[PDB]
């Protein structure tokens with residue numbers, strides 16, 4: 489399935505090239521511009537654990553998830569991954585725990601040492 493495919497066929501987008509964050513572009517977005525640090529970014533996403541459980545979805549809430557890019561308001565994989573996206577792009581990200589919740593996890597849904605899969609759609613970005 490999609491998590492296996494990004495694991496086996498994804499591109500390492502980390503600066504360290506430690507394969508901590510792998511990406512596949514599923515839908516090509518618009519133009520060439522990607523968001524900049526500090527931009528308010530609007531995304532839709534779903535997350536799955538490596539045991540197959542869906543742990544989160546913005547679609548199911550009928551509202552996007554909004555954060556300021558590059559400020560550690562989200563896991564490292566997202567700051568890195570969303571920074572690579574064009575407006576309208578949909579990607580898959582495979583996030584090793586060092587770029588996610590580490591040994592701590594995040595109760596109730598994310599265990600210790602969890603590799604996470606996300607589908608992310610970049611809806612919009614704007615500077616404040």
Ligand SMILES: COc1ccc(OCCN2C[C@H]3CCC[C@@H](C2=O)N3S(=O)(=O)c2ccc3[nH]c(=O)sc3c2)cc1OC
Pocket residue numbers: 535543544553559560561562563564566588589594595596597598
């Ligand atoms: C700078 O370091 C950090 C900053 C913020 C952090 O988390 C808050 C921001 N944040 C929110 C969401 C969506 C964006 C992605 C990610 C996220 O980071 N989670 S997530 O979908 O993986 C996710 C996790 C648990 C969970 N439990 C639920 O009941 S639903 C749910 C969803 C963690 C950091 O690393 C300690």
